[PDB]
Amino acid sequence: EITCQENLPFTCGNTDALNSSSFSSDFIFGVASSAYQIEGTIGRGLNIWDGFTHRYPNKSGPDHGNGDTTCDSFSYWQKDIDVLDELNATGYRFSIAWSRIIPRGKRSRGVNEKGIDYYHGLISGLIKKGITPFVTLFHWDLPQTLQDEYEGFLDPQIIDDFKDYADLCFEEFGDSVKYWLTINQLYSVPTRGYGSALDAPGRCSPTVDPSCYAGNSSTEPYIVAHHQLLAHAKVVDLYRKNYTHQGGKIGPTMITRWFLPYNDTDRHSIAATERMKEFFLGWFMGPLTNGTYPQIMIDTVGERLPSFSPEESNLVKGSYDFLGLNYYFTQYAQPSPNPVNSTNHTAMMDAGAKLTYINASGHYIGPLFEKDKADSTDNIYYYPKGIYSVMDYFKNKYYNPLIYVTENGISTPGDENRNQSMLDYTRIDYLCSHLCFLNKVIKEKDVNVKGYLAWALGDNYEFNKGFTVRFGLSYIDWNNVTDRDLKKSGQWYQSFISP
Ligand SMILES: *[C@@H]1O[C@H](CO)[C@@H](O[C@@H]2O[C@H](CO)[C@@H](O[C@@H]3O[C@H](CO[C@H]4O[C@H](CO)[C@@H](O)[C@H](O)[C@@H]4O)[C@@H](O)[C@H](O[C@H]4O[C@H](CO)[C@@H](O)[C@H](O)[C@@H]4O)[C@@H]3O[C@@H]3OC[C@@H](O)[C@H](O)[C@H]3O)[C@H](O)[C@H]2NC(C)=O)[C@H](O[C@@H]2O[C@@H](C)[C@@H](O)[C@@H](O)[C@@H]2O)[C@H]1NC(C)=O
Ligand SMILES: *[C@@H]1O[C@H](CO)[C@@H](O[C@@H]2O[C@H](CO)[C@@H](O[C@@H]3O[C@H](CO)[C@@H](O)[C@H](O)[C@@H]3O[C@@H]3OC[C@@H](O)[C@H](O)[C@H]3O)[C@H](O)[C@H]2NC(C)=O)[C@H](O[C@@H]2O[C@@H](C)[C@@H](O)[C@@H](O)[C@@H]2O)[C@H]1NC(C)=O
Ligand SMILES: *[C@@H]1O[C@H](CO)[C@@H](O[C@@H]2O[C@H](CO)[C@@H](O)[C@H](O)[C@H]2NC(C)=O)[C@H](O)[C@H]1NC(C)=O
Ligand SMILES: *[C@@H]1O[C@H](CO)[C@@H](O[C@@H]2O[C@H](CO)[C@@H](O)[C@H](O)[C@H]2NC(C)=O)[C@H](O)[C@H]1NC(C)=O
Ligand SMILES: *CCS/C(Cc1ccccc1)=N\OS(=O)(=O)O
Ligand SMILES: CC(=O)N[C@@H]1[C@@H](O)[C@H](O)[C@@H](CO)O[C@H]1O
Ligand SMILES: *[C@@H]1O[C@H](CO)[C@@H](O)[C@H](O)[C@H]1NC(C)=O
Ligand SMILES: *[C@@H]1O[C@H](CO)[C@@H](O)[C@H](O)[C@H]1NC(C)=O
Ligand SMILES: *[C@@H]1O[C@H](CO)[C@@H](O)[C@H](O)[C@H]1NC(C)=O
Ligand SMILES: *[C@@H]1O[C@H](CO)[C@@H](O)[C@H](O)[C@H]1NC(C)=O
Ligand SMILES: *[C@@H]1O[C@H](CO)[C@@H](O)[C@H](O)[C@H]1NC(C)=O
Ligand SMILES: [Zn+2]
């Protein structure tokens, strides 16, 4: 019987109690990263994250930091491999910058052979060290030209352009890459990029944020989400019909969260909690497993929710070999009004729920996840059991899918000096507490999880936060980004992997 801790202090940092041997022999352990966050603009065209961070510096991060140079993985990709080698990692998730291989967006406009070579070198290097690549085709960095031509994912033209880009990736890298992720965190761009405008491209309703150049927070998130599903499905169909000889697998990336009732004895809170599962997870999982949006979304969103044609429904349904599940935290849900007529209405309001980290009786869900200096009441807290609940839910609700945890991690303040940043015991606690529960859910619920990739191989530009927070298991000095030095967490993970 496996017992896992939910509150501080944690004792899972002892590799004598918890290690890779606790999992199946073939279980993959590694770390993850994304192109915009680690490469730098050198050698690539411009994308919407360059555009967004430059047009709206205040939105790039409190420090106005962006991905211009960041940790310079373009030049130091070998150093990334060295970190993985040091960790004895068996997996590495990275993303291909569309702007690096097709700077002009549309494939017919030509490709960047040097950009293609960059990824060939990285992939060859990973394989030579026994590291299995998990490659994300689209980690939000859409070529700026496509956003300017037709507003990217807001238009159906994105489908063919994404398909042609994916085709190039399969053609060029598919002989070596056997695990593909289509779109990173399906929920994110529709809501943050077209709803709240916290993320690129930065579209929203005029009253939601006067700085948005255009948009409609009430309708656009649904249009974008719909196109993401269609684009994703078209790419999966292309992969399975034209690249089956490669013997690989492909799937979407979902940002997952668990939800608990703000008040577990209040039917309204309980209902809001179930609505959140449907609006947050079901919005994409319903189409992916059934070819239709959840009924509660159909009923609530009405005319603002696009419909799948019979052909599209068939294309989207079952469009995955596995699911890349990112997991960070869990929230309490309570009822909230949905003012559809208000000029400030956002798609996020349709769920009719308010999310918190403290419940009705004043209980904080778990240890501190992220401290918000602007407002103490806006602090995020984590919940280790959430990963168990999410995996159990996916197996029972979404037809026992093959799963790879594609992201799981925690940040530490950017204000900390080198020594403080290196002594990241809070990260060991976060990682081990989640790994305990992941092992527990695999054994108790038989969830088909075959890999775990911790977020951020190293410190990098964090979307919306600049360099004010660090997520890496390895430290990076912003005055000399060459070195990737394993922090206490990286050293612990090394021992966890090879006890
Ligand atoms: C997994 O996918 C399944 C489909 O492959 C889902 O089952 C479908 O669920 C639909 C509801 O979402 C359901 O469609 C409704 O059908 C009603 C009856 O239509 C028949 O009878 C009519 C007689 O007058 C006739 O005119 C029709 O031609 C049909 O013969 C219909 O009245 C409904 O329309 C109203 O409600 C919808 C909102 O749901 C409104 O959009 C619409 O304007 C109207 O107000 C509705 O029809 C749909 O209307 C919208 C239109 O775009 C669609 O083309 C049209 O179908 C449908 O019958 C079933 N199909 C099957 C195979 O059972 C399944 O849904 C779950 O299970 C069903 C049974 C139901 O309980 C749902 O609530 C569940 O979510 C999906 N499962 C999951 C997990 O989501
Ligand atoms: C988690 O949710 C539950 C269920 O909603 C909360 O319990 C309910 O708390 C209500 C108070 O907010 C209770 O209603 C009140 O009852 C007293 C006594 O009769 C009455 O004088 C009040 O006017 C009020 O009555 C309601 O008034 C509005 C009407 O629409 C409604 O029909 C009336 O009932 C309610 O009875 C109670 N339900 C039950 C079954 O216990 C719960 O609140 C916490 O516990 C209750 C018992 C009370 O001590 C609250 O102060 C306390 O916050 C809530 N838990 C938390 C931590 O928020
Ligand atoms: C976002 O787009 C929606 C849809 O075009 C707008 O909602 C429409 O608003 C008009 C004017 O009040 C109504 O006549 C329609 O019935 C609404 N459509 C539906 C069914 O929602 C909404 O006003 C737009 N929001 C902003 C801020 O531009
Ligand atoms: C807020 O969360 C706390 C902690 O999960 C809940 O408290 C638990 O409630 C159960 C059921 O009454 C008890 O058996 C446990 O002993 C409680 N644990 C603790 C730490 O006190 C509490 O019920 C939640 N509040 C609401 C309104 O849902
Ligand atoms: C890549 C982070 S986006 C995310 C998870 C998260 C981590 C730290 C702080 C805030 C969020 N979830 O994406 S979304 O659910 O916010 O769209
Ligand atoms: C208050 C503040 O400092 N934030 C402003 C914001 O109000 C403004 O809409 C935006 C214009 O792009 O520029 C930000 O710096
Ligand atoms: C790994 O953890 C298990 C408990 O799950 C323990 O029995 C084993 O001794 C540990 N391995 C090492 C080498 O510490
Ligand atoms: C597979 O490739 C062929 C050759 O380019 C193409 O004709 C066909 O449409 C492709 N199948 C798809 C789009 O899945
Ligand atoms: C506008 O939206 C904001 C954010 O949800 C809300 O706080 C405010 O009350 C709304 N104003 C209106 C029109 O009620
Ligand atoms: C930058 O760091 C590298 C690796 O530690 C080192 O070799 C080089 O001398 C440093 N350059 C500076 C800033 O002096
Ligand atoms: C790396 O892991 C393999 C497989 O568990 C093990 O045989 C090998 O000794 C490890 N290498 C190091 C130096 O940890
Ligand atoms: Zn710049």
How was this entry determined? X-ray
Contact 340, 393 (CB under 8 A): no
Distance between CA 219 and CA 364 in Å, rounded? 34
CA distance 172 to 158: 21
For ligand 5, is residue 185 a contact (CB within 6 Å)? Answer: yes
Query: What would the two tokens of residue 488 be?
Result: 């206490």
360: which 2 tokens?
């009705």
Spatial separation of the C-alpha atoms in residues 6 and 366, rounded to whole Å: 7
Q: Using the mean position of ligand 1's atoms as its centre, give its distance from the Cα of residue 256 in Å.
A: 27
**Paired sense of beta strands 179-183 and 132-138, if any:** parallel
Q: 265: how many CB neighbours lie within 10 A of its CB?
A: 8
The percent of the chain in helix, strand and coil, each rounded to the nearest 5, is: 40, 20, 40
Give yes or no: 407 in active site: yes
C-alpha 57/C-alpha 466 separation (Å) is 10
Q: Tell me the DSSP string of 264-320.
A: TT-HHHHHHHHHHIIIIIIHHHHHHHHSS--HHHHHHHGGGS----HHHHHHHTT--
Q: Which ligand is nearest to the CA of 219?
A: 3
* The ligand 11 atom nearest the CA atom of 498: 14
The residue written with tokens 């509660």 in the block is: 296
- Cα 323 to Cα 11, 246, 344, 451: the distances in Å are 30, 19, 34, 11
- Looking at residue 379, which CATH number applies to its domain? 3.20.20.80
d(CA 266, CA 254): 29
- The number of domains in the chain is 1
User: Cα angle at 55 between 53 and 61, to 5 degrees?
Assistant: 35
Residue with tokens 């890496």: 472
Contact between residue 57 and residue 64 where contact means Cβ atoms under 8 Å apart: yes
Pick the catalytic residue: 407, 416, 444, 462?
407
> What is the residue type of 131?
I
Q: 434 alpha carbon to ligand 4 midpoint, in Å? A: 21
Q: Which domain holds residue 200?
A: 1-499
Structure tokens at 23: 């999992």
The whole-angstrom separation of Cα 84 and Cα 73 is 14
Task: Specify the ligand 7 atom closest to the Cα of 499.
Answer: 13
CA distance 348 to 339: 11
- How far is residue 115's CA from residue 132's CA, in Å, rounded to a whole number? 21
